[PDB]
Amino acid sequence: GVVRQWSGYDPRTGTWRSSIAYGGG
């Protein structure tokens, strides 16, 4: 698992993309 976020946050679904741990982070 990873431990770094970025601009891959989807507001439309309040979730991340996939590369990073979706659901908060």
Side-chain angles (χ1 to χ4, degrees):
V2 297
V3 297
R4 292 299 183 88
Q5 61 180 30
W6 73 294
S7 300
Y9 181 87
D10 183 89
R12 300 179 299 185
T13 62
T15 53
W16 294 94
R17 289 295 182 170
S18 180
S19 52
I20 294 65
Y22 66 100

mmCIF file of all heavy atoms in Angstrom:
data_model
loop_
_atom_site.group_PDB
_atom_site.id
_atom_site.type_symbol
_atom_site.label_atom_id
_atom_site.label_comp_id
_atom_site.label_asym_id
_atom_site.label_seq_id
_atom_site.Cartn_x
_atom_site.Cartn_y
_atom_site.Cartn_z
ATOM 1 N N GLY A 1 0.827 -1.237 0.000
ATOM 2 C CA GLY A 1 0.000 0.000 0.000
ATOM 3 C C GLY A 1 0.843 1.261 0.000
ATOM 4 O O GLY A 1 1.976 1.257 0.479
ATOM 5 N N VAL A 2 0.286 2.342 -0.538
ATOM 6 C CA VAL A 2 0.995 3.615 -0.599
ATOM 7 C C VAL A 2 0.711 4.461 0.638
ATOM 8 O O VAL A 2 -0.039 4.050 1.524
ATOM 9 C CB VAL A 2 0.606 4.415 -1.857
ATOM 10 C CG1 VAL A 2 1.002 3.658 -3.116
ATOM 11 C CG2 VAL A 2 -0.884 4.723 -1.859
ATOM 12 N N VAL A 3 1.315 5.644 0.692
ATOM 13 C CA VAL A 3 1.126 6.549 1.819
ATOM 14 C C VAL A 3 1.349 7.997 1.405
ATOM 15 O O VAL A 3 1.888 8.799 2.169
ATOM 16 C CB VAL A 3 2.077 6.203 2.983
ATOM 17 C CG1 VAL A 3 1.778 4.814 3.526
ATOM 18 C CG2 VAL A 3 3.527 6.308 2.538
ATOM 19 N N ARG A 4 0.923 8.329 0.193
ATOM 20 C CA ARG A 4 1.074 9.682 -0.328
ATOM 21 C C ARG A 4 -0.118 10.071 -1.193
ATOM 22 O O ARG A 4 -0.566 9.296 -2.040
ATOM 23 C CB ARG A 4 2.367 9.801 -1.138
ATOM 24 C CG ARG A 4 3.624 9.691 -0.291
ATOM 25 C CD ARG A 4 3.692 10.798 0.748
ATOM 26 N NE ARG A 4 4.925 10.739 1.530
ATOM 27 C CZ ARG A 4 6.062 11.335 1.176
ATOM 28 N NH1 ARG A 4 6.134 12.033 0.050
ATOM 29 N NH2 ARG A 4 7.133 11.231 1.951
ATOM 30 N N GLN A 5 -0.626 11.277 -0.974
ATOM 31 C CA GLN A 5 -1.770 11.777 -1.729
ATOM 32 C C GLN A 5 -1.322 12.717 -2.843
ATOM 33 O O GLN A 5 -0.128 12.951 -3.031
ATOM 34 C CB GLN A 5 -2.744 12.499 -0.798
ATOM 35 C CG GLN A 5 -2.133 13.704 -0.098
ATOM 36 C CD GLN A 5 -3.112 14.399 0.825
ATOM 37 O OE1 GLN A 5 -4.010 13.771 1.388
ATOM 38 N NE2 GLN A 5 -2.946 15.707 0.988
ATOM 39 N N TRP A 6 -2.291 13.256 -3.578
ATOM 40 C CA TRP A 6 -2.001 14.175 -4.672
ATOM 41 C C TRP A 6 -3.291 14.836 -5.168
ATOM 42 O O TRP A 6 -4.246 14.985 -4.406
ATOM 43 C CB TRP A 6 -1.284 13.430 -5.806
ATOM 44 C CG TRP A 6 -2.172 12.505 -6.582
ATOM 45 C CD1 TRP A 6 -2.775 11.371 -6.121
ATOM 46 C CD2 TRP A 6 -2.545 12.629 -7.959
ATOM 47 N NE1 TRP A 6 -3.504 10.785 -7.127
ATOM 48 C CE2 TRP A 6 -3.380 11.537 -8.265
ATOM 49 C CE3 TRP A 6 -2.257 13.559 -8.962
ATOM 50 C CZ2 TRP A 6 -3.929 11.351 -9.531
ATOM 51 C CZ3 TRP A 6 -2.802 13.372 -10.219
ATOM 52 C CH2 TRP A 6 -3.630 12.275 -10.494
ATOM 53 N N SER A 7 -3.322 15.232 -6.440
ATOM 54 C CA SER A 7 -4.500 15.880 -7.009
ATOM 55 C C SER A 7 -5.456 14.865 -7.632
ATOM 56 O O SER A 7 -6.216 15.198 -8.541
ATOM 57 C CB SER A 7 -4.078 16.908 -8.061
ATOM 58 O OG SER A 7 -3.245 17.906 -7.497
ATOM 59 N N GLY A 8 -5.423 13.631 -7.136
ATOM 60 C CA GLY A 8 -6.298 12.600 -7.664
ATOM 61 C C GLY A 8 -7.552 12.419 -6.831
ATOM 62 O O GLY A 8 -8.049 11.304 -6.683
ATOM 63 N N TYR A 9 -8.062 13.517 -6.284
ATOM 64 C CA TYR A 9 -9.266 13.470 -5.463
ATOM 65 C C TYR A 9 -10.497 13.832 -6.286
ATOM 66 O O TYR A 9 -10.560 14.906 -6.885
ATOM 67 C CB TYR A 9 -9.136 14.421 -4.272
ATOM 68 C CG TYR A 9 -10.334 14.406 -3.350
ATOM 69 C CD1 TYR A 9 -10.428 13.483 -2.316
ATOM 70 C CD2 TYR A 9 -11.372 15.315 -3.513
ATOM 71 C CE1 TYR A 9 -11.520 13.466 -1.470
ATOM 72 C CE2 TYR A 9 -12.468 15.305 -2.670
ATOM 73 C CZ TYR A 9 -12.538 14.379 -1.651
ATOM 74 O OH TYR A 9 -13.627 14.367 -0.812
ATOM 75 N N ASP A 10 -11.472 12.929 -6.314
ATOM 76 C CA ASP A 10 -12.704 13.154 -7.065
ATOM 77 C C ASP A 10 -13.813 13.682 -6.153
ATOM 78 O O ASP A 10 -14.353 12.941 -5.332
ATOM 79 C CB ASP A 10 -13.157 11.856 -7.736
ATOM 80 C CG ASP A 10 -14.399 12.047 -8.585
ATOM 81 O OD1 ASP A 10 -14.256 12.372 -9.783
ATOM 82 O OD2 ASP A 10 -15.515 11.870 -8.052
ATOM 83 N N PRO A 11 -14.170 14.974 -6.286
ATOM 84 C CA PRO A 11 -15.221 15.586 -5.469
ATOM 85 C C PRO A 11 -16.601 15.062 -5.842
ATOM 86 O O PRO A 11 -17.477 14.923 -4.989
ATOM 87 C CB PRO A 11 -15.117 17.086 -5.787
ATOM 88 C CG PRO A 11 -13.872 17.259 -6.594
ATOM 89 C CD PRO A 11 -13.591 15.932 -7.237
ATOM 90 N N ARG A 12 -16.785 14.777 -7.127
ATOM 91 C CA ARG A 12 -18.057 14.266 -7.626
ATOM 92 C C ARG A 12 -18.497 13.031 -6.846
ATOM 93 O O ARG A 12 -19.691 12.770 -6.702
ATOM 94 C CB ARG A 12 -17.945 13.930 -9.115
ATOM 95 C CG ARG A 12 -17.581 15.125 -9.981
ATOM 96 C CD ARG A 12 -17.462 14.735 -11.446
ATOM 97 N NE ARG A 12 -16.423 13.731 -11.663
ATOM 98 C CZ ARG A 12 -16.058 13.290 -12.864
ATOM 99 N NH1 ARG A 12 -16.645 13.762 -13.959
ATOM 100 N NH2 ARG A 12 -15.103 12.376 -12.974
ATOM 101 N N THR A 13 -17.526 12.271 -6.345
ATOM 102 C CA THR A 13 -17.823 11.066 -5.579
ATOM 103 C C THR A 13 -17.112 11.067 -4.229
ATOM 104 O O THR A 13 -17.036 10.041 -3.555
ATOM 105 C CB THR A 13 -17.428 9.795 -6.354
ATOM 106 O OG1 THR A 13 -16.017 9.787 -6.598
ATOM 107 C CG2 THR A 13 -18.176 9.718 -7.677
ATOM 108 N N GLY A 14 -16.599 12.227 -3.840
ATOM 109 C CA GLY A 14 -15.904 12.353 -2.569
ATOM 110 C C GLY A 14 -14.897 11.243 -2.325
ATOM 111 O O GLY A 14 -14.613 10.897 -1.178
ATOM 112 N N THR A 15 -14.357 10.682 -3.403
ATOM 113 C CA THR A 15 -13.378 9.607 -3.292
ATOM 114 C C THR A 15 -12.182 9.858 -4.202
ATOM 115 O O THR A 15 -12.238 10.695 -5.103
ATOM 116 C CB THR A 15 -13.997 8.241 -3.639
ATOM 117 O OG1 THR A 15 -14.645 8.306 -4.917
ATOM 118 C CG2 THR A 15 -14.997 7.812 -2.578
ATOM 119 N N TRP A 16 -11.098 9.129 -3.958
ATOM 120 C CA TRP A 16 -9.886 9.270 -4.756
ATOM 121 C C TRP A 16 -9.992 8.479 -6.055
ATOM 122 O O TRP A 16 -11.011 7.844 -6.324
ATOM 123 C CB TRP A 16 -8.670 8.809 -3.952
ATOM 124 C CG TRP A 16 -8.385 9.676 -2.763
ATOM 125 C CD1 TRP A 16 -8.822 9.481 -1.483
ATOM 126 C CD2 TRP A 16 -7.607 10.877 -2.743
ATOM 127 N NE1 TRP A 16 -8.362 10.487 -0.669
ATOM 128 C CE2 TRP A 16 -7.613 11.357 -1.420
ATOM 129 C CE3 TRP A 16 -6.906 11.594 -3.717
ATOM 130 C CZ2 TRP A 16 -6.944 12.520 -1.046
ATOM 131 C CZ3 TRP A 16 -6.242 12.748 -3.345
ATOM 132 C CH2 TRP A 16 -6.265 13.201 -2.019
ATOM 133 N N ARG A 17 -8.933 8.521 -6.858
ATOM 134 C CA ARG A 17 -8.915 7.811 -8.134
ATOM 135 C C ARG A 17 -8.788 6.303 -7.931
ATOM 136 O O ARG A 17 -9.785 5.581 -7.959
ATOM 137 C CB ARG A 17 -7.776 8.331 -9.015
ATOM 138 C CG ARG A 17 -8.012 9.735 -9.548
ATOM 139 C CD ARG A 17 -9.206 9.782 -10.489
ATOM 140 N NE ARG A 17 -9.419 11.120 -11.035
ATOM 141 C CZ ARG A 17 -10.274 11.392 -12.019
ATOM 142 N NH1 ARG A 17 -10.995 10.421 -12.569
ATOM 143 N NH2 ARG A 17 -10.408 12.636 -12.457
ATOM 144 N N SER A 18 -7.563 5.829 -7.726
ATOM 145 C CA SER A 18 -7.321 4.405 -7.524
ATOM 146 C C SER A 18 -5.886 4.148 -7.076
ATOM 147 O O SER A 18 -5.640 3.337 -6.183
ATOM 148 C CB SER A 18 -7.611 3.631 -8.810
ATOM 149 O OG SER A 18 -7.381 2.243 -8.634
ATOM 150 N N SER A 19 -4.940 4.846 -7.701
ATOM 151 C CA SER A 19 -3.526 4.690 -7.372
ATOM 152 C C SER A 19 -3.290 4.844 -5.872
ATOM 153 O O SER A 19 -2.493 4.114 -5.281
ATOM 154 C CB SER A 19 -2.687 5.710 -8.143
ATOM 155 O OG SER A 19 -3.187 7.023 -7.963
ATOM 156 N N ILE A 20 -3.982 5.798 -5.264
ATOM 157 C CA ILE A 20 -3.853 6.045 -3.834
ATOM 158 C C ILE A 20 -5.035 5.446 -3.076
ATOM 159 O O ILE A 20 -6.124 5.295 -3.629
ATOM 160 C CB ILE A 20 -3.751 7.556 -3.522
ATOM 161 C CG1 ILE A 20 -2.453 8.137 -4.092
ATOM 162 C CG2 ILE A 20 -3.824 7.806 -2.020
ATOM 163 C CD1 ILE A 20 -2.375 8.093 -5.601
ATOM 164 N N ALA A 21 -4.814 5.114 -1.808
ATOM 165 C CA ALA A 21 -5.863 4.532 -0.980
ATOM 166 C C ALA A 21 -7.083 5.444 -0.920
ATOM 167 O O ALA A 21 -7.070 6.478 -0.250
ATOM 168 C CB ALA A 21 -5.339 4.256 0.421
ATOM 169 N N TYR A 22 -8.135 5.054 -1.629
ATOM 170 C CA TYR A 22 -9.368 5.832 -1.666
ATOM 171 C C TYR A 22 -10.051 5.839 -0.303
ATOM 172 O O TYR A 22 -9.820 4.958 0.524
ATOM 173 C CB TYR A 22 -10.320 5.267 -2.723
ATOM 174 C CG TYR A 22 -10.819 3.876 -2.404
ATOM 175 C CD1 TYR A 22 -12.077 3.682 -1.847
ATOM 176 C CD2 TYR A 22 -10.036 2.756 -2.659
ATOM 177 C CE1 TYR A 22 -12.540 2.413 -1.553
ATOM 178 C CE2 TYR A 22 -10.492 1.486 -2.367
ATOM 179 C CZ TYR A 22 -11.745 1.319 -1.814
ATOM 180 O OH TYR A 22 -12.203 0.055 -1.523
ATOM 181 N N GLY A 23 -10.894 6.841 -0.080
ATOM 182 C CA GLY A 23 -11.603 6.946 1.181
ATOM 183 C C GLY A 23 -10.790 7.648 2.251
ATOM 184 O O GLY A 23 -10.350 7.023 3.216
ATOM 185 N N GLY A 24 -10.590 8.951 2.079
ATOM 186 C CA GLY A 24 -9.826 9.716 3.046
ATOM 187 C C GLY A 24 -8.365 9.841 2.664
ATOM 188 O O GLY A 24 -7.958 10.829 2.054
ATOM 189 N N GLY A 25 -7.574 8.835 3.024
ATOM 190 C CA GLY A 25 -6.157 8.857 2.707
ATOM 191 C C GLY A 25 -5.305 9.296 3.881
ATOM 192 O O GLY A 25 -4.233 9.891 3.646
#
